[PDB]
Amino acid sequence: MKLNIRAQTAQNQHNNSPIVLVHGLFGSLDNLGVLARDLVNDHNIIQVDVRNHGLSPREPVMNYPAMAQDLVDTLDAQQIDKATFIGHSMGGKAVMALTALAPDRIDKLVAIDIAPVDYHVRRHDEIFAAINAVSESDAQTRQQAAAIMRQHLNEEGVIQFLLKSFVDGEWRFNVPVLWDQYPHIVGWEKIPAWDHPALFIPGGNSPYVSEQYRDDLLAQFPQARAHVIAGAGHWVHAEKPDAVLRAIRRYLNDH
Structure with missing residues (x-):
């Protein structure tokens, strides 16, 4: 489409x-x-x-x-x-x-x-875990989200990249689908x-x-x-x- x-x-x-x-x-x-x-x-x-x-x-x-x-x-x-x-x-x-x-x-x-x-191979399990942790928390701003993500990831660059898609306390990408279809993506x-x-x-x-x-x-x-x-x-x-x-x-x- x-x-x-x-x-x-x-x-x-x-x-x-x-x-x-x-x-x-x-x-x-x-x-x-x-x-x-x-x-x-x-x-x-x-x-x-x-x-x-x-x-x-x-x-x-x-x-x-x-x-x-x-x-x-x-x-x-x-x-x-x-x-x-x-x-x-x-x-x-x-x-x-x-x-x-x-x-x-x-x-x-x-x-x-x-x-x-x-x-x-699975190369994004910790990233998915971080993404889910943010969604489960009460984080609304990028800073708040970053704090939670740093508990899962230690690559600041990756954290900031992902946060570009965190707007209004919501992820821009379709997490459920990305997880479900992961094998096809990799x-x-x-x-x-x-x-x-x-x-x-x-x-x-x-x-x-x-x-x-x-x-x-x-x-x-x-x-x-x-x-x-x-x-x-x-x-x-x-x-x-x-x-x-x-x-x-x-x-x-x-x-």
Whole structure:
């Protein structure tokens, strides 16, 4: 279905395809804003809220073909024939899934710290526990919520990231659905090879795009190009936005 979006016209017309930014699990359209603020200098930008996140509609279903179709529905609503997609983690998986669903609607592709594979692990149990603790408490403000979350998590950056979605004493994302569909989110549905250049930006201090996923990654993205950002964790764009943008533009300029 159609997603909630924030669109902005390029500050300078350069005949470039528009860019759609897609955030990851527990995120919102503001998360890739750091990239949008730079890319808007010469590209029309579309920032989306993935289903069950931010102010986008809620649905009990959460799988990549569905999320990819959401992107198509959103492009159709904006009357955009083709666009370049940049997605982080879960959003990167939705974008990769789109290459199999509607390849003609995609120009270039950037996947930030993510691989097209089923990770077969639970990596958010403590985060879910923190989220639930906040909901159970009487916390109404971000500060009050943070206090409770610090009792479960010790990564301040993660706490602050999650709190962006804590408004009016309520979580913007659909917790029940994210928990129920978790296996599908960390999971993956193998797709046919996309025979076009694709940029992968892994974090040097993250296991999301390590060597054990290389075979599967190349099987689906034969012309994959990787640009590892040293000293960066999973939210690479939050830690080293400049490094991420340099990689993105080198790929977009395709010299």
